[PDB]
Amino acid sequence: KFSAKRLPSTRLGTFLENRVNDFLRRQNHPESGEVTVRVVHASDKTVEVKPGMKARFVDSGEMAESFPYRTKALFAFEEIDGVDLCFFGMHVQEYGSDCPPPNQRRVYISYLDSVHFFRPKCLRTAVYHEILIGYLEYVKKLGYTTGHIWACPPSEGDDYIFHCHPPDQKIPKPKRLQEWFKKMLDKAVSERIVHDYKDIFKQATEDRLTSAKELPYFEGDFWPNVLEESIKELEQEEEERKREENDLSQKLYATMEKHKEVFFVIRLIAGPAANSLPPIVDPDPLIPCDLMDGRDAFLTLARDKHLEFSSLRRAQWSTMCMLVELHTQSQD
Ligand SMILES: CC(C)(COP(=O)(O)OP(=O)(O)OC[C@H]1O[C@@H](n2cnc3c(N)ncnc32)[C@H](O)[C@@H]1OP(=O)(O)O)[C@@H](O)C(=O)NCCC(=O)NCCS
Numbered sequence: 413k414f415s416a417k418r419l420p421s422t423r424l425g426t427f428l429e430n431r432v433n434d435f436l437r438r439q440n441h442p443e444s445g446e447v448t449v450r451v452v453h454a455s456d457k458t459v460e461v462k463p464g465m466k467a468r469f470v471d472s473g474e475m476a477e478s479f480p481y482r483t484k485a486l487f488a489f490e491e492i493d494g495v496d497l498c499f500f501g502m503h504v505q506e507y508g509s510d511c512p513p514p515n516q517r518r519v520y521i522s523y524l525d526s527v528h529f530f531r532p533k534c535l536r537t538a539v540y541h542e543i544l545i546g547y548l549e550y551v552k553k554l555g556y557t558t559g560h561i562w563a564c565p566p567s568e569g570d571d572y573i574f575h576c577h578p579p580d581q582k583i584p585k586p587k588r589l590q591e592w593f594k595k596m597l598d599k600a601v602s603e604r605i606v607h608d609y610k611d612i613f614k615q616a617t618e619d620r621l622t623s624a625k626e627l628p629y630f631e632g633d634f635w636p637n638v639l640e641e642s643i644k645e646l647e648q649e650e651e652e653r654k655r656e657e658n659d660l661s662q663k664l665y666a667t668m669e670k671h672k673e674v675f676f677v678i679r680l681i682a683g684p685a686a687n688s689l690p691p692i693v694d695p696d697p698l699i700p701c702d703l704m705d706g707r708d709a710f711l712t713l714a715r716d717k718h719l720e721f722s723s724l725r726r727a728q729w730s731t732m733c734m735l736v737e738l739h740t741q742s743q744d
Pocket residue numbers: 522523524525526527528536537538540562563564565566572582583584585588589592
């Protein structure tokens with residue numbers, strides 16, 4: 413059988429689904445189904461500093477040329493009427509205790525995506541939040557100190573993870589998505605999972621950040637590209653001054669303040685306890701899976717095989733195909 417449940421389990425997946433199903437049992441809703449969470453990709457990667465920053469800080473020996481991280485893809489499924497539905501997906505980047513500053517003991521949510529067919533409807537959002545809170549709960553247990561989120565909804569017609577969303581699934585505007593993450597984080601705060609959280613601007617200020625090299629630097633994130641753009645801005649200004657004869661940090665602080673409400677810095681472990689921690693040891697094995705290495709492969713598979721997630725029934729058929737692919741691609 414190629415069911416969701418028969419996908420190879422992990423500590424992380426097991427931890428998440430157990431949290432969600434305990435939550436569902438507590439709600440005792442007659443329409444809810446069993447939820448399965450599976451990590452379907454785990455691999456070692458590195459993000460390398462782009463030219464501008466390498467020139468400024470890497471060649472200077474002030475900053476590592478690259479940072480090692482593990483990427484994970486995980487999906488949540490719901491069984492209803494004995495039928496699998498994939499309804500939530502998320503890719504994360506995890507920077508371990510071996511990672512150089514400024515990235516060590518940090519996790520970053522690359523992207524998350526959903527299709528709105530969870531049953532019952534009235535528990536959908538709560539379940540998403542339980543997945544996210546459990547994730548923060550879990551990495552906090554392993555010893556990561558900080559979580560990072562870039563609250564950015566997809567542009568018109570773009571799919572983050574699931575090809576062809578339901579036409580009537582509304583896409584939240586920035587402010588709504590922002591409030592959504594806050595509600596999730598506030599729950600995590602009341603559960604003493606999250607210590608506190610701040611926008612990127614307030615965090616930098618409190619941390620007394622003085623140099624771009626101090627900003628966490630993640631694969632595909634907003635900040636490495638604004639830094640490259642900022643540096644080219646400096647170069648062109650320098651050229652203006654050249655003609656006339658014939659600060660990075662202040663550019664960054666300015667950009668940080670401008671877009672502060674989109675970027676969350678989430679403190680899992682703060683203060684002293686964040687300083688005498690054992691190495692991070694991840695009990696889960698690597699999980700090679702070309703289909704789920706970042707998001708393009710699955711979008712591409714979906715397009716190629718016409719797997720839409722645009723209705724409940726289309727989503728379930730697509731879910732079956734995805735699962736068959738995940739099962740066979742694993743098999744040797
Ligand atoms: C982020 C996400 C998982 C949240 O799903 P959610 O828990 O159902 O919350 P939403 O904010 O989307 O929807 C909540 C309600 O607001 C409504 N809503 C959403 N966007 C809206 C909009 N632009 N205008 C008016 N209403 C909107 C929804 O219809 C929903 O109504 P309902 O509860 O009465 O059914 C989902 O919106 C999603 O998958 N978005 C695409 C990917 C993404 O944005 N990822 C975040 C960046 S990493």
